[PDB]
Short mmCIF file of N, CA, C and O and ligand atoms in Angstrom, two decimals:
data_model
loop_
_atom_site.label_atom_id
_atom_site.label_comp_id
_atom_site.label_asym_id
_atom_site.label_seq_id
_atom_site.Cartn_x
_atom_site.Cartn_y
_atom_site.Cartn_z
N UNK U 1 0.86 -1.21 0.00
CA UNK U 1 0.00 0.00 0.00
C UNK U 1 0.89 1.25 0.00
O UNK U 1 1.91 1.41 0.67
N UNK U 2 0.33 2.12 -0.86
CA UNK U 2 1.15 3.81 -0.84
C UNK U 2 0.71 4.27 0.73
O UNK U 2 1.70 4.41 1.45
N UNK U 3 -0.42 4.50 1.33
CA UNK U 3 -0.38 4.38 2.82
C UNK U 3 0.89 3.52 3.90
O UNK U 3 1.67 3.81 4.81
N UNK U 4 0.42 2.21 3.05
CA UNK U 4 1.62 1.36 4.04
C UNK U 4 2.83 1.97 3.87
O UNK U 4 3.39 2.54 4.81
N UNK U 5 3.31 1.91 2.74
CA UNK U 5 4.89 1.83 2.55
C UNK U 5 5.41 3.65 3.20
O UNK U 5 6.61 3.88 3.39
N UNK U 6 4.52 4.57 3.42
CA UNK U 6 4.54 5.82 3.77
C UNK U 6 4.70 5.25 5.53
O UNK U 6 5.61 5.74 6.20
N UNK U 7 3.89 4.35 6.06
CA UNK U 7 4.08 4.11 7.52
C UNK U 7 5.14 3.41 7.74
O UNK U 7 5.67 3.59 8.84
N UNK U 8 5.65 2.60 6.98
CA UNK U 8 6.45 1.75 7.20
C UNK U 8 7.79 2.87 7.22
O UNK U 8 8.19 3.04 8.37
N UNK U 9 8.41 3.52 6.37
CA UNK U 9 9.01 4.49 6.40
C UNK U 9 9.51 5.24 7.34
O UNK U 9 10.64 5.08 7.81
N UNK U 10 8.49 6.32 7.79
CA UNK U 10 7.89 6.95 8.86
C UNK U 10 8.39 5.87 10.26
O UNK U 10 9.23 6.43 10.97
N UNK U 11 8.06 4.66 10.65
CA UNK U 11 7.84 3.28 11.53
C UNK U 11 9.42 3.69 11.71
O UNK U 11 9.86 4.38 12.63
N UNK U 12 10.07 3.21 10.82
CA UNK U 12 11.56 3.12 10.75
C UNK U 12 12.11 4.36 11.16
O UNK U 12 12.62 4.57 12.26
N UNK U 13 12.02 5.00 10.44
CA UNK U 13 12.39 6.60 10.92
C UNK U 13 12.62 7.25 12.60
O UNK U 13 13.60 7.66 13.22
N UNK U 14 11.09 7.07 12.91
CA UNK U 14 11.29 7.52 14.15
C UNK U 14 11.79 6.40 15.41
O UNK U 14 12.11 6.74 16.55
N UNK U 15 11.76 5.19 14.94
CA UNK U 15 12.39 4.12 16.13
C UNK U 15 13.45 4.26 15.87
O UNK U 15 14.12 3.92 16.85
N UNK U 16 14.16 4.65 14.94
CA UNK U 16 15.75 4.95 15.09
C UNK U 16 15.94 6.49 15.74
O UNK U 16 16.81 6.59 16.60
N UNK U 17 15.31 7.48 15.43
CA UNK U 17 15.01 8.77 16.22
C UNK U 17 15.19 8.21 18.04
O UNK U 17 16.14 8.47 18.77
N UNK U 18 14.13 7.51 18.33
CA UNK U 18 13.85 7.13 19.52
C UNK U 18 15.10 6.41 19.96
O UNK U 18 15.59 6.72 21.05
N UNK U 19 15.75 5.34 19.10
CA UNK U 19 16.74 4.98 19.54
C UNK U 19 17.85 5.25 19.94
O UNK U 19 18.50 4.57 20.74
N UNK U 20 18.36 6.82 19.17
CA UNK U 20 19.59 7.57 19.24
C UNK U 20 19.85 7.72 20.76
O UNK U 20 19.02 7.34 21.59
N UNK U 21 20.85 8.20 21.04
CA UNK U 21 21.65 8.58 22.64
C UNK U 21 21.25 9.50 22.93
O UNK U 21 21.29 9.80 24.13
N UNK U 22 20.70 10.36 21.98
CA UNK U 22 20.30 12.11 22.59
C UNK U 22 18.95 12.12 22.20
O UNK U 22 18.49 13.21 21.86
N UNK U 23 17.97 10.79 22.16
CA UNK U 23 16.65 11.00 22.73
C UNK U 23 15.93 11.28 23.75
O UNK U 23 14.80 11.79 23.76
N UNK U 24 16.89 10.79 25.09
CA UNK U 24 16.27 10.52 25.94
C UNK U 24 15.54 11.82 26.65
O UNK U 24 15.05 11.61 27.77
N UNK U 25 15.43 13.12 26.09
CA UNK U 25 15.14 14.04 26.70
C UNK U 25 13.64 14.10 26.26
O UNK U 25 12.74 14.59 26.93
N UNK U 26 13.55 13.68 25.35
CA UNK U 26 12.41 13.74 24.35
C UNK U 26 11.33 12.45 24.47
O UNK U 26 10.40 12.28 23.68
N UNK U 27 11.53 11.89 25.19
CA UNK U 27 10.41 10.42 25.28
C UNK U 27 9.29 10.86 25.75
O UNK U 27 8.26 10.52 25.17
N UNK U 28 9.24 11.51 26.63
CA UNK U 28 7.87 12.00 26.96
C UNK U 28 7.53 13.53 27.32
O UNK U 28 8.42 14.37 27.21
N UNK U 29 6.65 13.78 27.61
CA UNK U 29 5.83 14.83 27.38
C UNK U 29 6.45 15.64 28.84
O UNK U 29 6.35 15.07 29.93
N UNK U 30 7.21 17.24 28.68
CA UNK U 30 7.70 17.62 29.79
C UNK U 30 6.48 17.75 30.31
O UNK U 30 5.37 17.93 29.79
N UNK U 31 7.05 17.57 31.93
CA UNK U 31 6.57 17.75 32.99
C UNK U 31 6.15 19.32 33.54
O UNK U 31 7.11 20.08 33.62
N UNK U 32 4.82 19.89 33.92
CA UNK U 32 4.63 20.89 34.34
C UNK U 32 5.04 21.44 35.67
O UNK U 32 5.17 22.60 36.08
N UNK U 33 5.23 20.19 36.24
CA UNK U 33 5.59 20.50 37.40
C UNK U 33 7.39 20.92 37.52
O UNK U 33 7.96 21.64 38.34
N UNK U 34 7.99 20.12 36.25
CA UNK U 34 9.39 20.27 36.46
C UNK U 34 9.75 21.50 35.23
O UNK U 34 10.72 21.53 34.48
N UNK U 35 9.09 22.06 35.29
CA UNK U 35 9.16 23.00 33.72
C UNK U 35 8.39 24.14 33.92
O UNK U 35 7.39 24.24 33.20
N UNK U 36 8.64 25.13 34.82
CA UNK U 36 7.81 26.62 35.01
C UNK U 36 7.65 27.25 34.34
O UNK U 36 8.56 27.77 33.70
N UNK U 37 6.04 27.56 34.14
CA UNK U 37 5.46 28.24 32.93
C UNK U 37 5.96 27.70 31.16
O UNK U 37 6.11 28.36 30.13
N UNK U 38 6.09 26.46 31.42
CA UNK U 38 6.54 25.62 30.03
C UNK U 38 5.47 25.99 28.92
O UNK U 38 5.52 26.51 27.81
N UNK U 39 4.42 25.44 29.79
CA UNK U 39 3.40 25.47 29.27
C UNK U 39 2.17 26.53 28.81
O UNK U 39 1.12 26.27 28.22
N UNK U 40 2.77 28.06 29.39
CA UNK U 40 2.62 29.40 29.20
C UNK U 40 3.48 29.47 28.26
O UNK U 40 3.25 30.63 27.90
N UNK U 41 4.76 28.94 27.21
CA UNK U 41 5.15 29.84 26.23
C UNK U 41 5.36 28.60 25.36
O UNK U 41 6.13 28.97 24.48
N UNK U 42 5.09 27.46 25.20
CA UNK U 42 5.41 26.36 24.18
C UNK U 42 3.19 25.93 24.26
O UNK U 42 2.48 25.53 25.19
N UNK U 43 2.87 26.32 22.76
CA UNK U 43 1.60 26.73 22.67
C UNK U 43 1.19 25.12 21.88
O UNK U 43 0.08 24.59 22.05
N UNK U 44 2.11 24.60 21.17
CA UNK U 44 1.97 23.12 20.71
C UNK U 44 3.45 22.05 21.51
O UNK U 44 4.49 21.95 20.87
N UNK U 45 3.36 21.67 22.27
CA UNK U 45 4.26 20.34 23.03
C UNK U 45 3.85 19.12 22.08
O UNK U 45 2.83 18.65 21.58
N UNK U 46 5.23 18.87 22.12
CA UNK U 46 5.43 17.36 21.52
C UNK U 46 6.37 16.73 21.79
O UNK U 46 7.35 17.36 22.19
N UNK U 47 6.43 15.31 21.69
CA UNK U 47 7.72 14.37 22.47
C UNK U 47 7.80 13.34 21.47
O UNK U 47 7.38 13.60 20.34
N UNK U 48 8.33 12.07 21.76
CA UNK U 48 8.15 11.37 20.79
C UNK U 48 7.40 9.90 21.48
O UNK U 48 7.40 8.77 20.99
N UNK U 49 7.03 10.19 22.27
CA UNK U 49 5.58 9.08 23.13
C UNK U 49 4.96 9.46 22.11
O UNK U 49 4.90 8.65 21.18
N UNK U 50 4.26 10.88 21.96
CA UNK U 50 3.28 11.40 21.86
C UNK U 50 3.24 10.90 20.12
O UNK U 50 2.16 10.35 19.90
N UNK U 51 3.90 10.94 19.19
CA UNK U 51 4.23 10.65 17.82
C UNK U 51 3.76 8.96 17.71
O UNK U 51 2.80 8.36 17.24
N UNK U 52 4.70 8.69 18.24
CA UNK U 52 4.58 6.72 18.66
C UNK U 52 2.80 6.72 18.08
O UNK U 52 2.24 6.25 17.09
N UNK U 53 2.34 7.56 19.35
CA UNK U 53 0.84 7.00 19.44
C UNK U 53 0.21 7.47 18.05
O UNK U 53 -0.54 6.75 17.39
N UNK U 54 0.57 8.69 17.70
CA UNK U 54 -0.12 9.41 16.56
C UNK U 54 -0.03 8.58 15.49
O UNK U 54 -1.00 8.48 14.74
N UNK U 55 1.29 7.75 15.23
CA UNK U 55 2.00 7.04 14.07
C UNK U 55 0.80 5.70 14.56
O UNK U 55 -0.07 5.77 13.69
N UNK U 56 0.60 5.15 15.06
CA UNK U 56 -0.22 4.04 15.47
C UNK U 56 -1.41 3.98 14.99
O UNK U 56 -1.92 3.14 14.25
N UNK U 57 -2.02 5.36 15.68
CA UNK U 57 -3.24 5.86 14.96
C UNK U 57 -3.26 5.75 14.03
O UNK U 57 -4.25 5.09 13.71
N UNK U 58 -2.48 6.12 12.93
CA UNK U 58 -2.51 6.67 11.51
C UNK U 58 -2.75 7.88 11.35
O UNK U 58 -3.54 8.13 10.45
N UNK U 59 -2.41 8.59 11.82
CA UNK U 59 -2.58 10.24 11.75
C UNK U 59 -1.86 10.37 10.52
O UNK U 59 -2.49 10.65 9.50
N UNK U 60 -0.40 10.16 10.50
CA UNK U 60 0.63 10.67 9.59
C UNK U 60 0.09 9.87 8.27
O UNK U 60 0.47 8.80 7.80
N UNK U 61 -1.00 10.86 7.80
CA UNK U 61 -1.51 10.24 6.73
C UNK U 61 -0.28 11.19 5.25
O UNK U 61 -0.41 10.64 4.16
N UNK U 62 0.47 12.10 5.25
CA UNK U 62 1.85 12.75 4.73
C UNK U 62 2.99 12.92 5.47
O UNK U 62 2.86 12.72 6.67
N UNK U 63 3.82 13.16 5.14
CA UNK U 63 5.31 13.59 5.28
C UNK U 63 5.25 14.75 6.00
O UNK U 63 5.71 14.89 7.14
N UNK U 64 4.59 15.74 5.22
CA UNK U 64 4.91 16.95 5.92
C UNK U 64 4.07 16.70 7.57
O UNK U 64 4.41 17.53 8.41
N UNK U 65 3.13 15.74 8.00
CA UNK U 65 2.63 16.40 9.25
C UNK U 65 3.56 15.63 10.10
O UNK U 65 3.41 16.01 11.26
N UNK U 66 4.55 14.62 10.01
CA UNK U 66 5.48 14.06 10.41
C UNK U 66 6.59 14.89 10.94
O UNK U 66 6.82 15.27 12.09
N UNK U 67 7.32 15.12 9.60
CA UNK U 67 8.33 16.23 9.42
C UNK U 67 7.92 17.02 10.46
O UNK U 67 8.64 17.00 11.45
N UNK U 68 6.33 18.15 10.50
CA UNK U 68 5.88 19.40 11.17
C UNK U 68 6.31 18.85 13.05
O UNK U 68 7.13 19.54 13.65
N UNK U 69 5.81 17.87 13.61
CA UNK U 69 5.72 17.49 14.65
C UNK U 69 6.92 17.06 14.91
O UNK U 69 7.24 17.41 16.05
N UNK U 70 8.03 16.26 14.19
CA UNK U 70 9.16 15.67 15.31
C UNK U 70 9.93 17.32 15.09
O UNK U 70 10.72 17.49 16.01
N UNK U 71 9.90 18.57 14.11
CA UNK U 71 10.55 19.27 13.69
C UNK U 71 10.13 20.20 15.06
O UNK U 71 10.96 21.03 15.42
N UNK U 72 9.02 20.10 15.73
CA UNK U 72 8.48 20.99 16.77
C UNK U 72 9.20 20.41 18.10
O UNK U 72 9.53 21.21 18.98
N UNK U 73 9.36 19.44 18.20
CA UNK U 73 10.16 18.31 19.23
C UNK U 73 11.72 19.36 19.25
O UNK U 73 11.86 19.74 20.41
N UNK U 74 12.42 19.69 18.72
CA UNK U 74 13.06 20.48 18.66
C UNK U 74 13.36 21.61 18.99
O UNK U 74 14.19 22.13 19.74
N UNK U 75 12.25 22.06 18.06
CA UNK U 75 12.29 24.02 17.84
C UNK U 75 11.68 24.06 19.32
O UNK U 75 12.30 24.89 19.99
N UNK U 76 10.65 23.40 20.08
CA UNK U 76 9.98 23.80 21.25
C UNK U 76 11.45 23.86 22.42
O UNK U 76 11.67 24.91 23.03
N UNK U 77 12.36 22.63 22.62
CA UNK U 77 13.35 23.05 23.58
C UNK U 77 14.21 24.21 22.98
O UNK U 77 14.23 25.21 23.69
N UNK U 78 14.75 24.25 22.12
CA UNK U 78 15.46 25.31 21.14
C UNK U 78 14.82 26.41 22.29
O UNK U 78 15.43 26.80 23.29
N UNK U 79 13.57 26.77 21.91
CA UNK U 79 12.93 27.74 22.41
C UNK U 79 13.01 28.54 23.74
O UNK U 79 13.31 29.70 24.03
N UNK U 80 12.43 26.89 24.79
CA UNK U 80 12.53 27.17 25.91
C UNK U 80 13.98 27.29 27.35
O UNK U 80 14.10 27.87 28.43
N UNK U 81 14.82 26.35 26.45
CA UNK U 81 15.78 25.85 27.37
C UNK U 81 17.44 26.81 27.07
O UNK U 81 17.76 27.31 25.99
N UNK U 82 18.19 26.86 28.23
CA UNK U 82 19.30 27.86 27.60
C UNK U 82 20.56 26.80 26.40
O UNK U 82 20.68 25.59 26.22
N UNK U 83 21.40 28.23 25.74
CA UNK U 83 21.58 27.46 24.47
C UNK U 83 22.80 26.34 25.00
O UNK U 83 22.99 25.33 24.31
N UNK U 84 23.68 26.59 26.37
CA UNK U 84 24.51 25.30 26.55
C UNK U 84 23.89 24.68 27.20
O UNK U 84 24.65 23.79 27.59
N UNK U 85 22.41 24.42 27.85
CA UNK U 85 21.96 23.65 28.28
C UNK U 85 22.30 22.22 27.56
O UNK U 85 22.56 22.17 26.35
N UNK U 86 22.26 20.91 28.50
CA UNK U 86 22.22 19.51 28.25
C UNK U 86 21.08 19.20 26.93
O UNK U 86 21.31 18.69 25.83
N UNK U 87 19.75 19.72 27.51
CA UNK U 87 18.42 20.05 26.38
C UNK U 87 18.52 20.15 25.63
O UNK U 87 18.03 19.36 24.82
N UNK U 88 19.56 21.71 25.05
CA UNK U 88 19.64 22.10 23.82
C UNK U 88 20.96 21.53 22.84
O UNK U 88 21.13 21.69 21.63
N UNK U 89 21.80 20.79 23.85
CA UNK U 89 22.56 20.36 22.89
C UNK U 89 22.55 18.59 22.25
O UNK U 89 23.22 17.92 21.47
N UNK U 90 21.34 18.42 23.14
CA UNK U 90 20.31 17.01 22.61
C UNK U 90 19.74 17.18 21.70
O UNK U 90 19.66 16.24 20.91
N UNK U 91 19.01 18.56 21.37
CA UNK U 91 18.12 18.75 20.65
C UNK U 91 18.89 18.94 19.43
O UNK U 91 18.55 18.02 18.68
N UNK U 92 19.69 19.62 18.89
CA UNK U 92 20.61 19.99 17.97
C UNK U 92 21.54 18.62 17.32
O UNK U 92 21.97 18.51 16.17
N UNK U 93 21.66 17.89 18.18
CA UNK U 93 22.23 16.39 17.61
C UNK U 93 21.42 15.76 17.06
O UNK U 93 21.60 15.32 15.93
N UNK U 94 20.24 15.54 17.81
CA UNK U 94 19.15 14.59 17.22
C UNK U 94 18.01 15.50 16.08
O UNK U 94 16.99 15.06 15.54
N UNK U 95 18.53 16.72 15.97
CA UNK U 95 17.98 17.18 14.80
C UNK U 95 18.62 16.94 13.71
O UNK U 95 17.94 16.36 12.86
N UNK U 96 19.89 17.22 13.37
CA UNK U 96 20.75 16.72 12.49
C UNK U 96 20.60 15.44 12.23
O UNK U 96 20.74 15.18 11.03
N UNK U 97 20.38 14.61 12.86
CA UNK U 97 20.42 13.28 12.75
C UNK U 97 19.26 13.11 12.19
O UNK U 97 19.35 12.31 11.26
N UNK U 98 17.73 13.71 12.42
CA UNK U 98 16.42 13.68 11.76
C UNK U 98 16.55 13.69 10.41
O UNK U 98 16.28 12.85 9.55
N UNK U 99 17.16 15.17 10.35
CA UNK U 99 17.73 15.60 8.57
C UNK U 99 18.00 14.87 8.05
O UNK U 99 17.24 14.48 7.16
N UNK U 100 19.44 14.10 8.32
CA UNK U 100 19.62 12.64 7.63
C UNK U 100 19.13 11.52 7.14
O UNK U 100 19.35 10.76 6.20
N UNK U 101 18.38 11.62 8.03
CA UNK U 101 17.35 10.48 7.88
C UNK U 101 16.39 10.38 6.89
O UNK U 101 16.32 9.56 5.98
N UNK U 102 15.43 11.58 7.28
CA UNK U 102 14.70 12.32 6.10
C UNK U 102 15.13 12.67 5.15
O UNK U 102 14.20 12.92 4.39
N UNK U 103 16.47 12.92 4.49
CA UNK U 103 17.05 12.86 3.63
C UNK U 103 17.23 11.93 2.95
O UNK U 103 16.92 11.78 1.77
N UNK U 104 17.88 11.06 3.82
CA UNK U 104 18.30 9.08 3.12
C UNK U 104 17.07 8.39 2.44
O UNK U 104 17.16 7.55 1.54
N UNK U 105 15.62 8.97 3.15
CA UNK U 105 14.76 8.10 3.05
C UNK U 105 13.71 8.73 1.46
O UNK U 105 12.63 8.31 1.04
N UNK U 106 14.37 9.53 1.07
CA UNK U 106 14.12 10.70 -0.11
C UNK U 106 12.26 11.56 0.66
O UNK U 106 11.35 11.97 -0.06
N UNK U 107 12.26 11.56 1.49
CA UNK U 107 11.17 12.52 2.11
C UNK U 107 11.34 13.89 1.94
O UNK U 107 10.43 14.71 1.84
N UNK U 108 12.83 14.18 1.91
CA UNK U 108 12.81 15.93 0.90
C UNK U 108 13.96 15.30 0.24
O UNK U 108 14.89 14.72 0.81
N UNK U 109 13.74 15.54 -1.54
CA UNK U 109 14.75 15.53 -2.61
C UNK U 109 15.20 16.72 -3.41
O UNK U 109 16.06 16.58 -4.28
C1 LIG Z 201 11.66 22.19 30.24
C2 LIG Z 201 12.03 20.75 30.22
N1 LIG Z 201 12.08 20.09 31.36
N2 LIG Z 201 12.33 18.81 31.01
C3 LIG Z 201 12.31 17.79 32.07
C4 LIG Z 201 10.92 17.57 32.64
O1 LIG Z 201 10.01 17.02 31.66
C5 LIG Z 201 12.48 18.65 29.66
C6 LIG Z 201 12.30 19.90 29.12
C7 LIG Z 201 12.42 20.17 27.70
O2 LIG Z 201 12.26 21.31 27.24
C8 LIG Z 201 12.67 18.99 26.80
C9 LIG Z 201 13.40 17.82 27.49
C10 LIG Z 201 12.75 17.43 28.84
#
């Protein structure tokens, strides 16, 4: 199926995302309690629990709403956290590493 072979893709993609060394910041959904006023200036949160489930669903019925969401997984700590923070220099590895990926897999040519 052009559906399937788009999930299957996608499937692969982000379990190697998830798998990398500089995921672990990103598995789940920050904490409000450990994150003051997180949730006053990051207006869409995303992790990659939260994807898992979406990808399950079948949400990621394209590329781009894929791309849009792990690309927010990013830009949201980018945002919130300082730039030598541990956070931000997780976020910046495992973005590069996204690129690649999405690249290898011809999702932008
Ligand atoms: C803020 C913030 N605090 N925590 C830890 C609690 O969830 C995290 C953040 C992020 O911005 C992404 C990584 C995990």
């Amino acid at each position: 199926r052009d559906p399937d072979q788009l999930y299957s893709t996608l499937k692969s993609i982000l379990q190697q995302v998830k798998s990398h060394q500089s995921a672990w910041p990103f598995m789940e959904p920050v904490k409000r309690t450990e994150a003051p006023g997180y949730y006053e200036v990051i207006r869409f949160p995303m992790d990659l629990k939260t994807m898992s489930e979406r990808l399950k669903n079948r949400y990621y019925v394209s590329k781009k709403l894929f791309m849009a969401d792990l690309q927010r997984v990013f830009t949201n700590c980018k945002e919130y956290n300082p730039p030598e923070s541990e956070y931000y220099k997780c976020a910046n590895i495992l973005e590069k590493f996204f690129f690649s990926k999405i690249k290898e897999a011809g999702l932008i040519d």
